[PDB]
Amino acid sequence: LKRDKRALEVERTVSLAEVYAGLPKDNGPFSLAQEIDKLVSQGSGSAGS
Amino acid sequence: LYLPIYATPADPKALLSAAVATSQGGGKLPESFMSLWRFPHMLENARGM
């Protein structure tokens, strides 16, 4: 009761397509459109780091 | 010829006991703290305590 006090609120929206598309170029930046639809089609692969 | 006087001891004293009291000072209130509960809830809380 003494320590605990009202914690403020935020809602942030985070888009994973922008997180990976904006990836720092020391890792290969990619939008999920062109890797989902070929890692569906082929049994292996990766992008980013 | 002279018969001596038959001096005779008095009653025992009543033993007496002393009954003294002890005293200790009045208490001191803590510092009050403000908290986030509307009064009816903090009252049901304290009443339980």
Q: Do B33 and A5 touch (CB under 8 A)?
A: no
**What single DSSP character describes residue A43?**
S
Q: B33 — contact with chain A (CB < 8 Å)?
A: yes
Residues whose CB falls within 8 Å of the CB of residue A44, separated by 6 or more in sequence, listed in order: none
With an 8 Å Cβ cutoff, are B35 and A1 in contact? yes
The answer to whether A27 and A48 have CB atoms below 8 angstroms apart is yes
- CA-CA distance, A35 to A29, in Å (whole number)? 11
Q: What is the resolution of this structure in A?
A: 3.6
Tokens of B28: 């001191």
- Of the residues A1, A4, A5, A6, the best mutation for testing chain B's interface (the one with the most B CB atoms within 10 Å of its CB) is A1
Structure-token match 């002279």, residue found? B2
Counting every residue written for chain A, the total comes to 49
